[PDB]
TrEMBL record, chain A:
Gene name tied to this protein: blaR1
Source species: Staphylococcus aureus
Stated family: Belongs to the peptidase M56 family.
Transmembrane segments: 26-47
Coiled coil: none
Complete-protein stretch covered: 284 to 337 of 585
Protein name stated in the entry: BlaR1
Top-level lineage group: Bacteria
Automatic annotation (TrEMBL), chain B:
Stated name of the protein: BlaR1
Residues of the full protein shown: 1 to 337 of 585
Annotated ranges, domain Peptidase M56: 4-256
Family: Belongs to the peptidase M56 family.
GO terms for MF: penicillin binding
Species annotation: Staphylococcus aureus
Transmembrane feature ranges: 6-26, 38-55, 66-86, 130-149, 169-187, 267-288
Coiled-coil stretches noted in the UniProt entry, renumbered to this chain: none
Keywords from the UniProt entry: Membrane, Plasmid, Transmembrane, Transmembrane helix
Automatic annotation (TrEMBL), chain C:
Transmembrane segments: 6-26, 38-55, 66-86, 130-149, 169-187
Protein name according to UniProt: BlaR1
Segments forming domain Peptidase M56: 4-241
Protein's organism: Staphylococcus aureus
Full-sequence portion shown in this chain: 1 to 283 of 585
Family as reported in the entry's similarity comment: Belongs to the peptidase M56 family.
Organism lineage: Bacteria, Bacillati, Bacillota, Bacilli, Bacillales
Length: 54, 295, 241
């Protein structure tokens, strides 16, 4: 009956399902290492600067 | 020259989208919390283009040159305003009576936590709040202990601890300042806000993990009352408050509490509309046109 | 033709900002509300320089055309799906019994309010909703009437009645259509939120005015419970929950 979804409402929703999960770092790591490599790629791909201006 | 900025904006948005991308599934299908610390990487990556790796139309840059500077200056103010408040706030506190301490300890000894953070009382602000400085300060009004049989102490106290544990109040400050210099890309503000929601969710988990289920129900009910009693605040961006945040629901509650019984004399609308209209007429007097007219 | 795009956007934003100043100040300092109807005039203004009445670029122009076309098509699709959702709800509704009618009568007895709008019930949804069609339909859960002591009925009825009185639902319908077509100026979409925000506030003012001071807190408590104990849905985003 609330006008629209917001924070108080979201919190109450989560209160209904116990988060009985072992949220192992395994997953975050997989993403984090992937992510980092992509920034590496971004670098080879593109850089520039004004230091060139002889 | 500002071509660099454009490059910067693009890089930022790239990583930004990447994180947002993953999140959906991780919660939607697996109910995982994403450990928010990952977000610092967006900033880093976004700024890589500034490194001199080495391995007319530009009038606009003559201008963008100072847009940067001005924004920083304004933000310097914004930031400091809050910081100064914190100066003020901190110095007004006091330590506590043993009996309260005994109660407090009874609640929390179970954790036997790393007590290198601090508990103190207040004679000022209505709701308990927290911020960092270098000490991890938890501050709560005296009315709550004088009301020794309030019971809700059981839950309120723990909540604050939960913010203390991940050092939310530390990161927040740093993050803010750093972002201020890179004032150029509004997406960073999305992030500035977004991060908050996660912190609060985690805090709720934290609490539930320390109580019964019968109690869960009770707790949830107590939160609602904790929202009810007062107007909210935005006093310290460099802090976390208790009443959740600026919102529609809250605004409506505030108004219903206040008297609201009067008509404004009709002219106000009669004229505001006339006014608006004449001006658009004027706008038109000079401005109109479309390509079909171009024989 | 880029020029026309630009003009339309600019014109709209000009007035838009003007209006915002007024509302803020007027409420902030003198405690008054403005009747939201004025907002239609922003759409109008935005389309004046637009009509062909005077009283490199090639690429830019070509693409702009294409985007306009697609935006309208997809928003319409979204809108239409919702529209039949509404059809569904109507089909499934039913009238109430005599005593239930008698309860309504009591609540509205001294109100003697216009009866050219309709009150009906269904088991389909956990909380009441309303919509327009042309008949002003108020729908409540069929599970509520039997509760001899809910003391919700009183408040729920006035709340909705009040919404019905101002024909707010109609305005949203048409209003949305115009933004469906003029899909590109983000400001045009944004104003929708403002309309809703106030529409509900105003409704509350109405209700409070019809109840005892001693129960003001009662009303408020129910408002909270109405949220606390329920899941959220927005299938009909064109309607009020
Ligand atoms: C600049 C704005 C300033 C105003 C802010 C002031 C207001 C401050 C706002 C702060 C509070 C947040 C309120 C929440 C509102 C909201 O809808 O924003 C949500 C993001 O939605 C988007 O994906 C869209 C968000 C982006 C907004 C624009 C909409 C368009 C999106 C399409 C972009 C995708 C295309 C990619 C290419 C981008 C390159 C340009 C919030 O994220 P989350 O809660 O994690 O949801 C998870 C979701 O289930 C997971 O699905
Ligand atoms: C891209 C070109 C744009 C050209 C225009 C120049 C501006 C560019 C700079 C952009 C960022 C500035 C951010 C400030 C926004 C101005 C609004 C502004 O001044 O509004 C501020 C606030 C609060 O309104 P208030 O003053 O209390 O009066 C409300 C009154 O009762 C009733 O009135 O809006 C919200 O936070 C509610 C937003 C709800 C809408 C839904 C979500 C999307 C977020 C809205 C944001 C929408 C996103 C913005 C997109 C235009
Ligand atoms: Zn918190
Ligand atoms: Zn309503």
């Amino acid at each position: 009956f609330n006008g629209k979804k917001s924070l108080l409402k979201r919190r109450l929703i989560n209160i209904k399902e116990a988060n009985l999960k072992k949220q192992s770092k395994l997953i975050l790591i997989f993403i984090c290492i992937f992510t980092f490599l992509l920034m590496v790629i971004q670098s080879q791909f593109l850089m520039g600067q004004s230091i060139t201006d002889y």
